[PDB]
Amino acid sequence: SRTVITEVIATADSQGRFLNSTELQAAFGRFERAVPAIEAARALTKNQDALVKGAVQAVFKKFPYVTQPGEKGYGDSNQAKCARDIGYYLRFITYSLVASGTGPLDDYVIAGLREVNRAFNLNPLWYIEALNYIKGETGKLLSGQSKTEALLYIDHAINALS
Amino acid sequence: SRTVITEVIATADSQGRFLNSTELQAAFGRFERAVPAIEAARALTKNQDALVKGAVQAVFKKFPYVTQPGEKGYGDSNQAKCARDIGYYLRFITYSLVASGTGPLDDYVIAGLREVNRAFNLNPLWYIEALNYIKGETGKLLSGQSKTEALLYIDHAINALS
Amino acid sequence: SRTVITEVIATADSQGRFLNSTELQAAFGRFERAVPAIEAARALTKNQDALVKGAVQAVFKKFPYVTQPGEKGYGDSNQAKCARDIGYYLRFITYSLVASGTGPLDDYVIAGLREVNRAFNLNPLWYIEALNYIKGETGKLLSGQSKTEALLYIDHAINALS
Amino acid sequence: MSRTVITEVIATADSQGRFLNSTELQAAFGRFERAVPAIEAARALTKNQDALVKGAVQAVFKKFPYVTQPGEKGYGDSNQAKCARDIGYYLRFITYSLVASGTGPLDDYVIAGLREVNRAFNLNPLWYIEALNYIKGETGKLLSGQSKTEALLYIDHAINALS
Amino acid sequence: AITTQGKRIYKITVSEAGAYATNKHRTGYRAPIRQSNYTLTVPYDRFLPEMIRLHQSGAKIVNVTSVIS
Amino acid sequence: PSPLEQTNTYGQERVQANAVLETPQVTLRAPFTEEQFQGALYAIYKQVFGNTYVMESERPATAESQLRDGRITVRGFIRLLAKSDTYKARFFNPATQTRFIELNHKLLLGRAPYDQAEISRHVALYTSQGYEAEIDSYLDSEEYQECFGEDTVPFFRGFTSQPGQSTEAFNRMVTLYDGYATSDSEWDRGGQSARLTDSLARSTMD
Amino acid sequence: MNDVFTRAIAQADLKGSFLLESDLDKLASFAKEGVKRLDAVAALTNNAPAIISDAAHKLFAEQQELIQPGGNAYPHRRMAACLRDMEIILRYVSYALLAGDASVLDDRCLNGLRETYNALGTPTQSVARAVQLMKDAAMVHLKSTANVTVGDCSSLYSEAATYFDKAAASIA
Amino acid sequence: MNDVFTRAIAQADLKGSFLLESDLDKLASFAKEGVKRLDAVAALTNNAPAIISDAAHKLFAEQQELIQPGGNAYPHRRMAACLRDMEIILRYVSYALLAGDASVLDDRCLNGLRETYNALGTPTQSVARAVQLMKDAAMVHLKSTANVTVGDCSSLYSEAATYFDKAAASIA
Amino acid sequence: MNDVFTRAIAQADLKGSFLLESDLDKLASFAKEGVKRLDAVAALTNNAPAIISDAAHKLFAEQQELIQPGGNAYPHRRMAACLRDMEIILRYVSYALLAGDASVLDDRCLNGLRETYNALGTPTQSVARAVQLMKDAAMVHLKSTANVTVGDCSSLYSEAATYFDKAAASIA
Ligand SMILES: CCC1=C(C)/C(=C/C2=NC(=C\c3[nH]c(/C=C4/NC(=O)[C@H](C)[C@H]4CC)c(C)c3CCC(=O)O)/C(CCC(=O)O)=C2C)NC1=O
Ligand SMILES: CCC1=C(C)/C(=C/C2=NC(=C\c3[nH]c(/C=C4/NC(=O)[C@H](C)[C@H]4CC)c(C)c3CCC(=O)O)/C(CCC(=O)O)=C2C)NC1=O
Ligand SMILES: CCC1=C(C)/C(=C/C2=NC(=C\c3[nH]c(/C=C4\NC(=O)[C@H](C)[C@H]4CC)c(C)c3CCC(=O)O)/C(CCC(=O)O)=C2C)NC1=O
Ligand SMILES: CCC1=C(C)/C(=C/C2=NC(=C\c3[nH]c(/C=C4\NC(=O)[C@H](C)[C@H]4CC)c(C)c3CCC(=O)O)/C(CCC(=O)O)=C2C)NC1=O
Ligand SMILES: CCC1=C(C)/C(=C/C2=NC(=C\c3[nH]c(/C=C4\NC(=O)[C@H](C)[C@H]4CC)c(C)c3CCC(=O)O)/C(CCC(=O)O)=C2C)NC1=O
Ligand SMILES: CCC1=C(C)/C(=C/C2=NC(=C\c3[nH]c(/C=C4\NC(=O)[C@H](C)[C@H]4CC)c(C)c3CCC(=O)O)/C(CCC(=O)O)=C2C)NC1=O
Ligand SMILES: CCC1=C(C)/C(=C/C2=NC(=C\c3[nH]c(/C=C4\NC(=O)[C@H](C)[C@H]4CC)c(C)c3CCC(=O)O)/C(CCC(=O)O)=C2C)NC1=O
Ligand SMILES: CCC1=C(C)/C(=C/C2=NC(=C\c3[nH]c(/C=C4\NC(=O)[C@H](C)[C@H]4CC)c(C)c3CCC(=O)O)/C(CCC(=O)O)=C2C)NC1=O
Ligand SMILES: CCC1=C(C)/C(=C/C2=NC(=C\c3[nH]c(/C=C4\NC(=O)[C@H](C)[C@H]4CC)c(C)c3CCC(=O)O)/C(CCC(=O)O)=C2C)NC1=O
Ligand SMILES: CCC1=C(C)/C(=C/C2=NC(=C\c3[nH]c(/C=C4\NC(=O)[C@H](C)[C@H]4CC)c(C)c3CCC(=O)O)/C(CCC(=O)O)=C2C)NC1=O
Structure with missing residues (x-):
């Protein structure tokens, strides 16, 4: 994926040159911001089931008509797929917080999502909600640093969806 | 925008060589298809207003939960824009029929389609329907041929909109 | 080889798109003009011997000076290879009629004719007459359209020889 | 993959998709005629190699006195053997470039990548320049005659490369 | 490129001169014929190869203008 | 006729590349619409990326928009493509530098490398002046400049004699192309291993 | 890369005789059937999003592991590639249909896909089943006679079926 | 390409479950000592010219078969390539140390270097000896504590030595 | 490539010694005959189109199956490629004659011809017959004394014959 240390290694490879104080400063700051991000990962991991259920029922609240028969939402298998997708998204957001970047999230959901969207008619607005x-x-x-960084990760995901 | 002879011009200029037969039989293809499209354009010019109004009512029909207050379908100027949109699409369709090519349709609606669609919450499926x-x-x-190429051209418009 | 059908299929494949109107209208053109083309090819295949041998005689009559002993045109094998080459040309003109495109001519005899001709000091004029x-x-x-299109293809043959 | 006049001619001709025109033949004739003074110079240099290398050693010593004292890079019996070996190889490749009628031997053998060798071994070119x-x-x-300037051209090019 | 000395892109107006066309004919038309005059925008770092290559091609530079500074 | 039949293009299909020789080059010359634009970009993306499918999110919108206006030549757009990180991630990042240079030749020049001396020289160039200078060298190279031109999408010019091309270029690109289906992503381990090194080795000596 | 007439010319030149009247009659009949073949090609082109979508739906109904974590199509990039591969094979089959013969697929589409899917780790049988369901959905759409001159294109349906069959065989 | 964090996330995706709290704590501990690792790699990079100079000098003192004509590193170009070879080996070892995983060193220097040198005729054991000498110079230079706070970096020393070990085992 | 002087420098570098006096003697012998080499290469280049044309005449005469349909010269584009092949092989043999070292022909030309014509389906025995016919046609102009100072050049004849024999056995 694209972690800060990974992209630093790659760019250092590019110009055919070793690392310098600037990129080591970037890695430094990554290391310190990891700890609030690590706590964010803990808080998100311990809450994952309630997160998924609440998100699913919030989407249902916003668009109850989707649950009507003959539509995508109707069907217990359909709802299970909704929950599984939201769980995958939450897990990749945890991976984003751990990795201190969008690398894993970008590569594993953002790469080639709109294709499936168009093919399977999966409206992004649902996952946005x-x-x-x-x-x-x-x-x-x-709260504090962890809340802000998790918020920026998830709103990055939202902006990618839209 | 191109008529078939227009891409003929483009290629013949590109290779810097005179027209060979193939583009000339293409020119035929255009001419012998011209007339059916001509009475097709006549008929669509005749039916325009009823087309627009009925399309507005039907797009209200199949999607009733957008006619509800608080979204895009709700709104007087919204519906006026629906009507003017349908008028523009079918006018460009007549233009394409006259050209016997998709050119005007492409360079007048198709460019920048998807990003406009989600940039203003205007569901493409609305125009598909x-x-x-x-x-x-x-x-x-x-009837007969004119029906057939009209079907094909608005089908292509749908496929670009879909 | 190289046909209007093949031009359509290649100019759709290299761009990886499904076929749309214009090229399939060209396909209508091909499939409708096939019958005059194919009957013209039938007639040409029906009369080959007179064409080839009288062509050889016409080359002699238009170039008496190549017939005498001691020059390149002289020789039994030389006359045999005359008839061979002109038979090949009639062959490939018929083929082009069948393909409804000037492809096979270009693939076989038009590709590299100049340097092989100057390789053996061949005068392309001989073939032109x-x-x-x-x-x-x-x-x-x-008669008419078949005659018109056979004339077209052979004229292209001279033009390439020109 | 050496670059000599005839080999350069052949490479150019192959690149252009053509045969050899008048200029290539004239250049080949010039190289063939100039080979004789170059061979004369090569043999003459071959005769007196030991004097050249020894005089080069003492000239390098006399020009920069700060070297041959202990405690620095140049001091040492192995260092002296390496000096002799390096000067010998230098004159070897100079003779090779004389015979080839081209600098390609020198370039490929030593001038290719010389600078990183120097900076990885602290060898300022000035010693070999002297x-x-x-x-x-x-x-x-x-x-004498042509052989003198034939040697001069290649050795001057080698010095300029060392610069 | 990113450097403050890498920036200051300059635009170049290039004329396919008569000598350029004579050289092009002998080399061969491996590129489509375009009108002799054409414009171009070139960054500072690759500014040099542009007029160098135009010089081996035989063409001459009409003028130079600076996008930045 | 002969007991053994040799069709017109028989060499084209017995060798893995028949349509490749049949497929024409594509140029973007005069103002145009979105349709053949998208086609040209699809062709370019199949060309440069060794039949690796590029996710629609990965592509740069600004570069293609500027190309659409035409202020930047297609050569500049190819430069921007190669400089894009996805090129390195697919090609430069999972593959060795010798294999990287082989892939770079095959993609942006459409031909196999001529001699191992060329590979050595280009490795030296990469070591001495970074990654981007190698791409700038290829796309600024006179060979590309004349063989394609400012407005020509790169195409596989192997499988065909070229002015001043090594005899081993044909063999290497036959061994290296291996069909439309061949991909050069971080997968298949074929884009990582330098196949052409063995063939390049025999050309060093005689 | 050849269509019916081109290949006819091919072995015709191979035998070194003129096009016999019988072969001309066959080609003229083909051209007479030409509009029906173009109708089938247009039907394939129109329903392409529908057929790709619904065939994917049956595939992922009858198999789950491809969408399961670590599955051969688990990431969205890999799902998108999984769908567009079927889209490409369908496009090439329609190419062959309008070309009248299956030369195009063997020439470029399927000459070496099998090694590519082994290297990618993709199981072949899954691809074969996907092609088969693509075939079934395409047949269903082509049997529809809405807004077309009714008739008998039994040759065309069977011939597209042969296309898809040999495509799946080449996958293996 | 992949580091320790990326590798752990990759395994998590392979099992499809969230990162374990134990492994999250392991990554937290790794990040806590990241300043020491950054100091180690900085010591690598400043002493890298010194490390390579020492390794080259001692290798050429022990091996003389290359400085003479017919040696694999006899001409200036050849031995310069040799020097940059060790330089790049050390550079990729440093990259792996930054990553904490050998995936990047495998991707760069250890996918196909062996057959590359076999084609070039390069003896691999000489490269391995050069790797060992660079490893010795590097442990010497990083076991010093100039201008930096002192602490237990034996884990980093072991990791760097083992990375050199994998590199040497790969080449020879 | 590696010419005769390049060959001498290569062996001198490999054994690490200077030029011996006999080496200078043989290189001077090569230098003095360079006029005869110029005459030979001029003769070959000037008569090249005639030589290749008549050689192809005897070629297609001796083997009449290549030209006729189903042969590898039939489609008359293959004829153009065939002429290109004769001219290019004569071009590289002229190159090798000029350099006096067969290295250029062996590397730049004959490295891949074998596998190339396997991939192209060409009868290679026919190509060997072709190049032998080339030497037969070219030796005519070789011993031609028109417009030039007369002199025995038997070494040049033998060297040209050996070059063509090397090419023939290569493509054989
Ligand atoms: C291709 C032919 C060739 C050349 C050109 C060559 C020059 C050369 N000399 C070297 C070492 C050396 N060379 C010298 C000679 C120096 N002593 C001082 O008086 C002078 C500045 C200078 C000579 C006048 C010394 C002292 C060393 C030892 C450097 C060291 O190990 O610290 C080295 C490094 C190899 C090693 O350390 O064993 C090279 C490449 N070697 C070759 O095989
Ligand atoms: C990214 C991974 C990777 C790297 C870094 C790599 C280095 C590398 N070394 C090469 C050749 C070489 N490598 C060496 C090194 C030798 N010299 C001494 O004798 C030792 C036996 C040994 C080093 C201790 C030499 C001398 C050459 C030149 C071969 C020649 O010209 O004969 C080459 C090809 C030709 C060139 O670049 O000049 C590469 C790419 N190859 C790779 O796949
Ligand atoms: C990288 C991991 C990954 C994810 C996350 C993913 C999403 C995903 N969910 C799918 C099905 C689904 N996805 C949803 C969820 C949406 N539909 C609406 O009803 C809801 C409002 C909304 C939820 C917010 C539903 C209901 C289905 C079943 C019906 C369908 O295919 O559209 C499909 C189509 C294949 C199938 O399961 O049948 C994909 C590709 N694919 C992946 O490889
Ligand atoms: C890359 C990770 C990173 C982020 C995201 C970041 C933002 C950030 N800004 C902060 C303080 C602040 N942030 C702001 C700016 C905001 N407040 C104002 O009301 C505006 C509405 C708004 C500006 C648009 C202000 C005014 C402060 C307090 C001033 C100070 O820094 O002492 C804090 C400390 C409080 C906390 O723990 O959440 C963070 C984390 N810092 C980081 O290292
Ligand atoms: C695909 C179709 C095709 C073409 C276009 C073709 C050109 C062609 N014609 C040939 C025979 C030939 N054809 C001619 C010219 C004819 N004979 C003369 O008497 C007349 C002036 C003239 C008839 C008007 C000549 C002179 C040769 C053989 C050259 C020679 O032996 O001197 C040859 C073989 C050369 C040889 O045997 O020496 C070729 C390649 N071959 C083909 O298979
Ligand atoms: C670097 C110098 C060089 C060489 C050595 C070379 C040989 C060569 N000949 C080729 C094709 C060919 N070569 C020939 C000629 C042969 N077939 C007939 O039997 C003749 C007797 C015989 C002539 C000696 C033919 C007919 C083809 C076409 C084969 C095909 O398209 O299937 C090809 C494939 C691409 C092409 O050139 O069109 C090569 C590489 N090409 C080069 O650029
Ligand atoms: C010339 C026409 C053509 C062919 C033949 C073709 C095959 C093909 N499949 C690919 C990847 C792929 N192909 C598939 C599809 C298969 N794997 C799944 O298991 C399914 C069972 C099945 C689809 C139903 C998948 C999932 C990938 C993703 C692997 C990856 O790229 O990492 C790629 C790599 C392209 C890239 O991402 O850069 C190619 C070239 N592509 C083409 O443009
Ligand atoms: C520009 C695009 C365009 C199209 C596509 C088009 C359709 C078209 N279908 C035709 C006949 C036909 N079309 C079909 C095919 C249909 N019938 C059934 O078999 C199938 C459900 C279906 C095949 C997909 C058939 C069977 C005929 C009658 C020909 C015969 O019976 O021999 C004809 C010839 C005139 C006629 O008899 O109606 C046209 C022009 N017209 C156009 O201008
Ligand atoms: C630009 C990159 C960068 C560097 C170079 C850097 C140096 C650096 N090293 C530190 C701690 C440290 N640094 C080291 C590593 C060193 N000590 C051991 O003896 C080894 C000899 C050697 C590593 C091989 C250790 C062991 C600590 C103590 C851990 C701690 O303070 O938490 C600290 C924290 C100082 C403090 O907490 O008061 C800094 C700023 N910081 C940076 O952001
Ligand atoms: C511009 C390029 C160039 C050419 C073309 C060239 C040919 C050439 N050959 C010469 C002598 C000669 N040339 C030849 C070679 C010929 N005599 C043999 O009988 C064969 C017929 C044939 C070689 C196969 C010989 C043997 C000599 C006499 C030199 C001697 O004593 O050996 C001379 C000197 C006599 C004079 O100027 O009239 C020239 C100019 N020299 C050049 O610089």
């Missing part, structure tokens, strides 16, 4: 609910929910689950 | 209904009434409006 | 003989006869053997 | 200076001083009498 789910992530907005996760934002509101982590606003109380997290 | 509108054009499909238009196929519905134009199946009987036009 | 052979073609002139051929157009002289096809002015009689064929 | 060595070649003494070398041309000695060959100022060793050769």
